[PDB]
Design a protein around this ligand. Structure first.
Ligand SMILES: CSc1ccccc1Nc1nc(N2CC3(CNC3)C2)nc2c(NCC3CC3)ncnc12
Ligand SMILES: CSc1ccccc1Nc1nc(N2CC3(CNC3)C2)nc2c(NCC3CC3)ncnc12
Lengths: 301, 296
């Protein structure tokens, strides 16, 4: 159906089906055991942010790769259950739709993971070329396949080059795997999210060390953003002023999985409503804090 | 009287092929992944079908998207599902199977729904005429013994020529299942059970377990790479070496391939030595492949 011009936030990245099994003890190889409970969850960075943006009330769409099959079917039904627009999915003729097996040991909390395979092709610059941008007010890009996503960021530059500032598409970018290739993305986007995990791998020991240490890599005008779990979040604009907001503990921690994706989506949401970076950092921390003390995304409002 | 029937579980097998088995708290990436129609009786149907034997599955299934997948697969394989006992409480069981591609080890983590078992009631409602053979997967004992008795009874009224051959699996160490040994013409007891009951080889198990079977039965016991053995009324031990494929790459469903194949050979009137041998021949071929496609 019809989507008004400049109304949606698009997130480009991975979606994955996570099968999550709760067990008594860790299974010894070659055994047949009952679990305590099992969940199928839609997962992936761009995937969760879309969920959040919908709960938060933004019209939103997801672009990532799927393969026709029963796994897609479930994934697409969960997306749709959360109000996400999937009209831009990149259906692939080759490969498996990503699925992961996660096993959680009850008596200790340990999480073991068999990660999804690498059979399916990522979204590509030509795939992306085929997309009429006018619907989007904001596009956000999970960092995965760097050299291609670069062409897409360049496409969005082009488009923008020719629009009145009030019809310009804002861009955000996320670097979250400690992978050499990803670092070029730093130079793109109006907003750049970097993760505790990545920043540590580059040697920095805190948001402040990371922002000040990496801001030299961001394109002029950009806001560089970093969250540090219970130590809060920071942000660094072109004016050089290091911003900060403390965390917000929930009455008690229940599920941290996906909180970074909640933080990103919330910051993006706030900035898109024209709030100030400081107000965004704040909001970010508030909603991610609330998520942590909840199971999945249901109660975040 | 042309079909073979199997009574047990169907399960959605969410499979991950990895090259080494993950250690506590670690994180590895699989080589590939697939969905597969699972459950013992389910697998056996697959194998019977692939061998050209008309067969039919019977077990509980909850309607949903999972079931739809299972059903379609049953049909692509010509398994008669018209005997299925649908529910309205619960969902389709499913599990995560980690298959270690470097020795074919298979770790199964099962989510058993509360989904109701098949009951003597449901069973008492089936036309026993179409079946040369009926193989029961031992899950709910006290309730299945009734199913069996209904079969023993049906036998009395028929020529010692048109009787319903009956086979029985005892795969899990559960105490309740132990009453089942004394039923059906052929009885499959797994290596696992065997060891749990203090026995160290198929030879010894067979000796120490024959006491528990119906008069005139054959006790069968596979033992992976060691082969499988059998014991009949004549008191003579039968043996068959295994048939190792070049590389073992996937042993999920081997035992259910063994059983189907033994059953199949028997329903074609081959001898117990010949069926034991064929069982190993097929389970063996199976272990060198991902899936079932291609054992024939
Ligand atoms: C700045 S908000 C944020 C952003 C990204 C990721 C997580 C968060 N928020 C929180 N993360 C974690 N955590 C902990 C882990 C789980 N593995 C690391 C992230 N703990 C808390 C907390 N209390 C718990 C602290 C551990 C004692 N209270 C509020 N927000 C967060
Ligand atoms: C008697 S055939 C049989 C019956 C039921 C279940 C399995 C099998 N067959 C085999 N199972 C296993 N296995 C291994 C496990 C997986 N952990 C137990 C079952 N390994 C082999 C094998 N392995 C390699 C050869 C020694 C070189 N070669 C032939 N048949 C089987």
């Amino acid at each position: 159906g019809l989507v008004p011009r400049g109304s949606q936030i698009l997130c480009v990245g991975l979606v994955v089906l996570d099968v999550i099994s709760l067990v008594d003890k860790y299974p010894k190889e070659d055994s047949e055991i009952r679990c305590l409970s099992q969940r199928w969850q839609r997962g992936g960075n761009a995937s969760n942010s879309c969920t959040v943006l919908s709960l938060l009330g933004a019209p939103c769409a997801f672009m990532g790769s799927m393969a026709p099959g029963h796994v897609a079917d479930f994934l697409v039904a969960d997306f749709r259950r959360r109000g996400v627009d999937v009209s831009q999915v990149a259906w692939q003729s080759k490969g498996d739709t990503p699925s992961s097996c996660c096993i959680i040991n009850n008596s200790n909390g340990n999480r073991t993971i068999v990660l999804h395979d690498t059979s399916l092709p990522d979204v590509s610059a030509t795939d992306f070329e085929k997309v009429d941008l006018t619907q989007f007010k904001w596009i956000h890009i999970e960092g995965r396949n760097a050299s291609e996503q670069v062409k897409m960021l360049q496409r969005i530059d082009a488009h923008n080059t020719r629009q009145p500032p009030e019809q310009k598409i804002r861009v955000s970018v996320e670097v979250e795997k400690p992978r050499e290739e990803l670092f070029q993305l730093f130079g793109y986007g109006d907003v750049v999210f970097v993760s505790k995990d990545v920043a540590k791998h580059l040697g920095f020991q805190s948001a402040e060390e990371a922002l000040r240490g990496l801001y030299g890599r961001v394109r002029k005008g950009a806001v560089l953003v970093c969250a540090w779990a219970e130590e809060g979040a920071d942000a660094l604009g072109p004016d050089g002023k290091l911003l900060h907001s403390d965390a917000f503990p929930p009455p008690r921690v229940v599920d941290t999985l996906g909180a970074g994706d909640t933080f990103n989506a919330s910051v993006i949401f706030s900035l898109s409503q024209g709030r100030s970076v400081q107000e965004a950092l704040r909001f970010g921390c508030q909603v991610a804090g609330k998520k942590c003390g909840l199971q999945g995304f249901d109660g975040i409002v």
